[PDB]
Amino acid sequence: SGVNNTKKWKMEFDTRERWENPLMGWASTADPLSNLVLTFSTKEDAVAFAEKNGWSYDVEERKVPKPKSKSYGANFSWNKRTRVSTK
Amino acid sequence: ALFVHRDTPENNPETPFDFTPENYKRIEAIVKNYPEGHKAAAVLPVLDLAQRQNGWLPISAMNKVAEILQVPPMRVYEVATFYTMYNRKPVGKYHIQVCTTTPCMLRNSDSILEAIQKKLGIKVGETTPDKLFTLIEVECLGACVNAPMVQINDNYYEDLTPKDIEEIIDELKAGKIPKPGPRSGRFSCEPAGGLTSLTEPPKGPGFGVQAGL
Amino acid sequence: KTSFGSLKDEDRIFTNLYGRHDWRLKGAQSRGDWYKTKEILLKGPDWILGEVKTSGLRGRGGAGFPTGLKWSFMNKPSDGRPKYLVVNADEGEPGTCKDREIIRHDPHKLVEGCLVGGRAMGARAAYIYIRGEFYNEASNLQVAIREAYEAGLIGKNACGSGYDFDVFVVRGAGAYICGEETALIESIEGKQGKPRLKPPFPADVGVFGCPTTVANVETVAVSPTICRRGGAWFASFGRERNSGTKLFNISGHVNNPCTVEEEMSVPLKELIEKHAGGVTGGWDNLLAVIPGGSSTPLIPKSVCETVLMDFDALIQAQTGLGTAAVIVMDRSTDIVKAIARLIEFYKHESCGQCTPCREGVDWMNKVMARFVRGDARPAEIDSLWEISKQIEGHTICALGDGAAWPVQGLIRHFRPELEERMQQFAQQHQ
Numbered sequence A: 001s002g003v004n005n006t007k008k009w010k011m012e013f014d015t016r017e018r019w020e021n022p023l024m025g026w027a028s029t030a031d032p033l034s035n036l037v038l039t040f041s042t043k044e045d046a047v048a049f050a051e052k053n054g055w056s057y058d059v060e061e062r063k064v065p066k067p068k069s070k071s072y073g074a075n076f077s078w079n080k081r082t083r084v085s086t087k
Numbered sequence B: 001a002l003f004v005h006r007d008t009p010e011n012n013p014e015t016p017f018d019f020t021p022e023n024y025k026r027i028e029a030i031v032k033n034y035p036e037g038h039k040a041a042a043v044l045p046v047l048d049l050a051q052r053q054n055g056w057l058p059i060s061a062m063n064k065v066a067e068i069l070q071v072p073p074m075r076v077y078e079v080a081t082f083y084t085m086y087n088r089k090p091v092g093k094y095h096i097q098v099c100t101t102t103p104c105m106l107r108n109s110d111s112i113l114e115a116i117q118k119k120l121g122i123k124v125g126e127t128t129p130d131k132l133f134t135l136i137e138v139e140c141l142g143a144c145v146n147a148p149m150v151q152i153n154d155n156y157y158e159d160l161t162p163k164d165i166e167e168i169i170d171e172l173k174a175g176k177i178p179k180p181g182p183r184s185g186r187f188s189c190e191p192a193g194g195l196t197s198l199t200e201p202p203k204g205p206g207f208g209v210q211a212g213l
Numbered sequence C: 001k002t003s004f005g006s007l008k009d010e011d012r013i014f015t016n017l018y019g020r021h022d023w024r025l026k027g028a029q030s031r032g033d034w035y036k037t038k039e040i041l042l043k044g045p046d047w048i049l050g051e052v053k054t055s056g057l058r059g060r061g062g063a064g065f066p067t068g069l070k071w072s073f074m075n076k077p078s079d080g081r082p083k084y085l086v087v088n089a090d091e092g093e094p095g096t097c098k099d100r101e102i103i104r105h106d107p108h109k110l111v112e113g114c115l116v117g118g119r120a121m122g123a124r125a126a127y128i129y130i131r132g133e134f135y136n137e138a139s140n141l142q143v144a145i146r147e148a149y150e151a152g153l154i155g156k157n158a159c160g161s162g163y164d165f166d167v168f169v170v171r172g173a174g175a176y177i178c179g180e181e182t183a184l185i186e187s188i189e190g191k192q193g194k195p196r197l198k199p200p201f202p203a204d205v206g207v208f209g210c211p212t213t214v215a216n217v218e219t220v221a222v223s224p225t226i227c228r229r230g231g232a233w234f235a236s237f238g239r240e241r242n243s244g245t246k247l248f249n250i251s252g253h254v255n256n257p258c259t260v261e262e263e264m265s266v267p268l269k270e271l272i273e274k275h276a277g278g279v280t281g282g283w284d285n286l287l288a289v290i291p292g293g294s295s296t297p298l299i300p301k302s303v304c305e306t307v308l309m310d311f312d313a314l315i316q317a318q319t320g321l322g323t324a325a326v327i328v329m330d331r332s333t334d335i336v337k338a339i340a341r342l343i344e345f346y347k348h349e350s351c352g353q354c355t356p357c358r359e360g361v362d363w364m365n366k367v368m369a370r371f372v373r374g375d376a377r378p379a380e381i382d383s384l385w386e387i388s389k390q391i392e393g394h395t396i397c398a399l400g401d402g403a404a405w406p407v408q409g410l411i412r413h414f415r416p417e418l419e420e421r422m423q424q425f426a427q428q429h430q
């Protein structure tokens, strides 16, 4: 339920091939950016960093939970379906 | 003592249960005490009625209550396991319930529980092989000034001594149904050795009524 | 006044407390019940709430809220939902058996109280919730209610006032927690007896989600008399803010355990000696008293010498009036075991809904069981004190508080006894 990992903007790159090492079965790669993840305060900072480095990019808008209407009393409604059958 | 059900040949969904036609008439009266649209309020009395007819509640009896009142079986299962008066396994003809909370303990409810076990030969929580008695300890029964006391089925037997509760059990074996109430000499909760109050004849209608009425 | 007690029979309300007169309607009417009830109903809810407020009456169920103000929460315009009075006859507090006598010996006082009380709140019906073990008392009450219906005292045109009122008896199924007011409502609705959080408050969202007031049997049963004899008459008994008479249960180690009606603010020592026949073995054989049922902390003999039995005085003694269930323990009692058995009671009665009481009361029970044997270290006493303070004030309902207070009373007043038992166990097992 924690939301502290949804504060900052992240930049990551497209995933590329990983294959099994013949000797051990370990996961091998030839992608130097496979682990590179950058952190930004705003999408504007992220976009500015991407542009000056020549990277084509996709921006995804921030998803925020919409405000909910919560009422403990609706659990016991006289005539509404919100009446709970157990606690 | 478990709160999970396992099917057995004697307790499973195909165990036979059904309300008698007379008991169905009582259910209507029960269901009509609550507002229309809130029939689930009748689960406790209807479930208790099933136990009064059958002596206890097999899972089939719980399913029937859920079916009649149109509530999920789980909600009936929750009620049956929450309240301690519902017997989810068979009990004996006479369910002996000894109170052992502190006020009764202070007045030697231990000697009562000991006497019953010695007479019946069983331990707490057990049923006799003849299946006439089941013995359990219970919390305060609301008769503390009449301690030590027991409840057998629907009746309170009060102010007990080891002699008193052995006569009560002997009467139950003999088939006689003993009278409930204190066995010490007083009739209810009045102090022993004579009333310290309410000795004068009571005032009649209108006594002390204020002006204006 | 300076001295309270020696209540006279004329001033007793529950005049058939011992069942030595007829409890059925004819007896009740000849004792002054159901008298000028129509006149009271036609004075209106505001007048009734006036007399209850003036009387200084406070809830007799244990919490002791001022009844007049509490009942006035329902005196508001209707919004469409029906309004209900729920009468609490669960009577679960150990040492408390006062409501049992009203139901079976003075049932018509309760029925009239429901009608008069229900009128003040604009209620359409009263649901009397009686604990399932009180089967014979419930049947007595049911017979009394039939008589009132047959006489036209309740139901359509109750007493001829033009007010329609119903009285229903619903039985419990064995659960001390169902005496808590919101857990009582949840039980009537057919769920597990688990208390609700507040808000909403029952006067806004109650039984079936409708405006409701939960009132104790004794509180409701005295309302007809207060309206007849006046609030000024009731307020003339007891100390200020502690008015009226009160039913007392005296059990434990007394010569004559009994239920008696006595003035509020009566000295505790006088009550035990005048009515209960004195402490077994003499007043000097006293060890401790639980003054208001198992939930109230115990007080030792020294405090009992002068403490008065009313709400304010017992709060000064670091306990509470509670239900006025006096449980007496003499010097032969194993005090640690006695309190341990009460924690075992709360462990068996916790509804399990909320963490501090589900886990904490069970935790306190295991510690107390070791304290009885002395199988502990003194550092665990302050641990137990801190555990109890983590339960109190952090639970949904007051059962958690009721489990922590008896523990605190033991530690507060009998810490040396706990330490002696621990010291002795170590020697035998060193």
Ligand SMILES: Cc1cc2nc3c(=O)[nH]c(=O)nc-3n(C[C@H](O)[C@H](O)[C@H](O)COP(=O)(O)O)c2cc1C
Pocket (backbone or CB within 6 Å): C058, C059, C060, C061, C062, C063, C064, C065, C067, C088, C089, C090, C091, C092, C093, C176, C177, C178, C179, C180, C181, C182, C214, C215, C216, C217, C219, C220, C397, C398, C399, C402
């Ligand atoms: C665990 C628990 C058990 C209770 N049992 C009862 C009871 O048996 N009878 C009662 O009147 N109040 C009982 N109460 C108190 C009620 O919640 C409530 O305060 C009372 O019914 C209010 O009525 P009154 O203002 O007339 O006292 C209990 C409270 C708790 C927390």
Ligand code: SF4
Pocket (backbone or CB within 6 Å): C177, C194, C195, C349, C350, C351, C352, C353, C354, C355, C357, C358, C395, C396, C397, C398, C399, C400, C401
């Ligand atoms: S304090 Fe105990 S009885 Fe009260 S709601 Fe929490 S778990 Fe249930």
Ligand code: FES
Pocket (backbone or CB within 6 Å): B099, B100, B101, B102, B103, B104, B105, B139, B140, B141, B142, B143, B144, B147, B149, C094, C095, C096
């Ligand atoms: S302690 Fe046994 S009836 Fe109350």
